[PDB]
Design a protein around this ligand. Sequence first.
Ligand SMILES: O=S(=O)(c1cccc2cnccc12)N1CCCNCC1
Ligand SMILES: *[C@@H]1OC[C@@H](O)[C@@H](O)[C@H]1O
Lengths: 353, 18
Amino acid sequence: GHMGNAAAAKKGSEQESVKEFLAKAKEEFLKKWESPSQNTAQLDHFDRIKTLGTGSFGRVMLVKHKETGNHYAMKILDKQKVVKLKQIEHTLNEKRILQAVNFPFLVKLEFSFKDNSNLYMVMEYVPGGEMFSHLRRIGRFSEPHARFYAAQIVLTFEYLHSLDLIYRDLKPENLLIDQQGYIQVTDFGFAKRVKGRTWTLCGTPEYLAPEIILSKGYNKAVDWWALGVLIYEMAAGYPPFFADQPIQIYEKIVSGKVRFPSHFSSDLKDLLRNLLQVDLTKRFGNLKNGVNDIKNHKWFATTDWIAIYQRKVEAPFIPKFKGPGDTSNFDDYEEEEIRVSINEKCGKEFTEF
Amino acid sequence: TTYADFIASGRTGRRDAI
Ligand SMILES: O=S(=O)(c1cccc2cnccc12)N1CCCNCC1
Ligand SMILES: *[C@@H]1OC[C@@H](O)[C@@H](O)[C@H]1O
């Protein structure tokens, strides 16, 4: 067979230990799910430094905690805007997930609170910026560089799926690089508890699995499809399916055809053909062997999964960091004010936040 | 090239969700 006795015994024991870890992680998650934390700071505890990100989701600001001096990224949401855009459930669910999970590649929520106008999530500051910026700057990542990042996503999805959480928001725009060069996943607005199927149309055109496009009841295998898109884009510098307009992208996705740059290794192409598999009965991550079909694939043969989890692998790239509070890896924005109001807004809808 | 076609698509900056 492909493995001798010693290698097969070692892999079997490793896979059993992952099961043991995940069972304990699930018990810990469910306890925190039932008893969420609440109102653990207030706005005057922080200095506002600079806007890090702005959009329909509200804004994220670099702040400094007055007492301790530590920097954080504070996501601010306007309650009245959340209501207008029909996002109450997604907002409450994102905060509930973040306060309940624990994994080295998932961003940590340190504080949350609200006031008359806004909701606040105070998260660890991840100073390296978005993978998107680095990928467009360098052009494409070499296969070892891409593999280092992909391994972290595989482990993170293995963790989330063991909690019965579907992720659905994977793309380079939504991955941050930390000071040690490792990945941080931050956005949980599309995440959902899904033990069987779910049906919502959500995501980004280039990263949509065919079964979402085709309006099916789908399952957590859409995340493994999206991992295929991510690995492809990291290694090529462009994604496998693109076009002027989303409709043409969807036509390519569902076609069952994908083409590769001539510099992709044969191992990489084989892995991608099994992730970008339109047939769910054949897609890696959705088979009897689960995540092990991915972890044991030849493209990952050099990957030490425990060492990645323990953050003991030297990262291929370390982002420039000229000290704490450095924001050079983020974009520049116009600093709109944080206006509070004398009248509470939307107290009923956000009572559990 | 395929890369040229990518640039020409225009979908080469940050991409919004649907
Ligand atoms: O970079 S963020 O502003 C950001 C969010 C959450 C925590 C963060 C921590 N440090 C820096 C930036 C952070 N960002 C907003 C939405 C776009 N996708 C990536 C996350
Ligand atoms: C890709 O980058 C975004 C935009 O500038 C486009 O024209 C392409 O260059």
